Amino acid sequence: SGSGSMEDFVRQCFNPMIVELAEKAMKEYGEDPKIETNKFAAICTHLEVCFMYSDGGSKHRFEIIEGRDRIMAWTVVNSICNTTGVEKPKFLPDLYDYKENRFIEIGVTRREVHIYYLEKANKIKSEKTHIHIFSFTGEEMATKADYTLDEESRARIKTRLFTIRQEMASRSLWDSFRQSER
Ligand SMILES: O=c1[nH]c(-c2cc(O)c3c(O)cc(O)cc3c2)ncc1O
Ligand SMILES: [Cl-]
Ligand SMILES: [Mg+2]
Ligand SMILES: [Mn+2]
Numbered sequence: 001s002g003s004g005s006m007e008d009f010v011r012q013c014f015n016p017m018i019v020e021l022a023e024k025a026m027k028e029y030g031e032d033p034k035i036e037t038n039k040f041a042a043i044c045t046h047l048e049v050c051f052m053y054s055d056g057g058s059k060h061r062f063e064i065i066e067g068r069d070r071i072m073a074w075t076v077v078n079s080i081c082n083t084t085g086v087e088k089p090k091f092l093p094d095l096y097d098y099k100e101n102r103f104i105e106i107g108v109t110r111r112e113v114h115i116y117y118l119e120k121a122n123k124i125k126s127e128k129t130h131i132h133i134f135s136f137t138g139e140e141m142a143t144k145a146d147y148t149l150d151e152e153s154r155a156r157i158k159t160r161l162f163t164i165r166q167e168m169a170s171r172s173l174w175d176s177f178r179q180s181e182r
Contacts, residue, residue, distance in 0.1 A: 001036065001037075001038050001039075001177065001179075001180045002035075002036065002037035002038040002039075002041075002173075002177070002180065003037060003041075003171065003176070004034065004037070005171065005175045006037040006038060006040070006041060006176070006177070007033070007034050007037045008039050009167070009168065009171055009173060009177050010022075010040050010043070011035065012049055013044075013164065013167065014044045014048060014153060015048075015159070016174075018047050018048055018051070019044065021046060021047055021067050022040055022043040022044045023040075023171060025043055026040065026043060031056045038176060038177050039178040039180075040182075041168075041173075041177060042180075043176075045108050045143065045161070045164065046079050046106070046107075046108045047066065047067060048160070049106055049108055049134060049157060049161070050055075050066045050067065050094050050095065050106055051064070051067070051150050052156065052160065053094075053095065053104075053106060053132075053149070054158050055155065056149045056153035056154075056156070056157075057097075057099070057148075057149060057153075058099075058152075060098070061093060061097065061098055061099050062095045062096065062097055062098070063076055063080065063096040063098065063105075064094075064095060064103075065077060065092060065093055065094055065095060065096065066092075066093075066094040066095070066106075070092070073092050074092070076096070077089070077092065077093075077096075077103075080096050083102055086101060086102065086103075086128060087127050087128050089103055089124070089126075089127065089129055090123075090125065091123070091124055093124075093129055094106040095131070097148060098143055100130075100146075100148070101169070102128060102129070102130045103128070103129045103130065104129070104130045104131075104148070105120055105124050105126065105129055105130070105131050105132070105133060106132055106133075106134075107131065107132070107133040107134065108121050108133070108135075108161070109133055109134070109135050109181070110135070110136060110177060110178045111178075111181055112135075112139070113133045113134075113135050113139040113140065113141045114141065116133050117131060117133050117141050120133070126143075128138065130142070130143045130146070131143050132147070132148065133182065134158065135161070135162060136161045136162060136164065136165040137162075137165075138158045138161075138162060139155060140158065
């Protein structure tokens, strides 16, 4: 589901490190990036947001968990849980917030945000894990309506997501993409 024009877009739009991390994530499930090109973009976007979110508070307020191999990912997680004694999650989250001492799952959606907020809450079966959704239309939604970052930072993120929708639109990739969301 998608085009080599979408493939080309991904390679032009996203930082090479992000591109390679997504190619690796997909291949680990037997998916081919130059075929399932809508997932390629989807995975790339979720990564970029995660990295943007981490560089949004103070220095080293967040530990990044997404983008890491499973062993290092669980190394970080297991260590944080030892140093802080917070309930160890059953699935790998995306960040840890040292300041509010909780994990964060981050969602990015091309549908309505309330819908994606539940599927996460149900899959993550989040005990103490904080959830935070974003859309490409400027919608956001967080646990107990706690948005963690300041607005200048949250807006830096929403504006980037908007930016991507548009560039996709000009290239006529957006509906396929909006359509293909499982
Ligand atoms: O929140 C997260 N989401 C994802 C994730 C993984 C996928 O494999 C996806 C896919 O194949 C299609 C799709 O439309 C969206 C996808 C999102 N990975 C890590 C997270 O923290
Ligand atoms: Cl990384
Ligand atoms: Mg993740
Ligand atoms: Mn996530």
